[PDB]
Symmetry: C2
Subunit: 143 residues, 2 copies
């Protein structure tokens, strides 16, 4: 069913397993989860948003850029974007995790979104991941 | 003299003033300094190093990738890299800041290095900035 997600992203994965990896919560399967991709995606997003703010607010001091970036690159914002993509429908987690409300946990939603951006960067490069991420941000925060 | 720094960076600036900008400490001139470029470059470097480690340590958990990144992306390491480029020789700062040892401060050296990488990213893009940054990192710190 991940095809629906690809359509929402405007990005079709060459390696489908890579998207599944990004969608795999830590509860699901031994030694296979989205934590490394989330690490990579978070670094991607800090550059995407930092660069965006640097250009958009040419007169803003570093402190302003930093705080504005914190206001965008965070669990709440990413969980919002995740929900706009119905990510809870695609994330893989154990029965117990789902019964404990995992599909609605902001951390799980946020982590999966960041891992997806990491996965797009891995497969397609920074500039591509940037264009995808900026579209999602501009649809959710029309700043 | 600036050509010497470019030679050390193995990168020739298209816009020379951009490099000047990256080299301008906050003490030097009102409303013009390297702090915004440092912010941008720090983000570039966190991605360059995060990606490098992600691939180099394909098995490592996030905690281990983060520790390895902290071993590279830090003031002490960046100041060492800056010193390898003789960066203190090129940083612009007030007389007072210079007399107070500013060209020798690891924070100032690190900031200027990160600002230079930000500037390269700005004019040439991420992949070029990544190439330059990794050369500097590997020339200094092949053990990580
Ligand atoms: Cl991975
Ligand atoms: Cl600037």
């Amino acid at each position: 069913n991940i095809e629906k997600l690809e359509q929402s992203l405007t990005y079709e994965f060459k390696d489908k397993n890579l998207l599944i990896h990004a969608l795999t919560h830590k509860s699901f399967k031994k030694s296979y989860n989205n934590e490394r991709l989330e690490f990579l995606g978070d670094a991607v997003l800090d550059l995407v948003v930092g660069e965006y703010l640097f250009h958009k607010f040419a007169k803003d001091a570093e402190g302003d850029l930093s705080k504005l970036r914190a206001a965008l690159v965070n669990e709440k914002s990413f969980a919002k974007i995740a929900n706009s993509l119905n990510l809870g429908d695609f994330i893989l987690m154990s029965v117990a995790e789902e019964n404990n409300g995992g599909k609605e946990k902001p951390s799980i939603l946020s982590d999966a979104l960041e891992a997806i951006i990491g996965a797009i960067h891995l497969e397609a490069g920074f500039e591509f991941a940037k264009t995808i991420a900026l579209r999602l941000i501009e649809k959710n925060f029309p700043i």
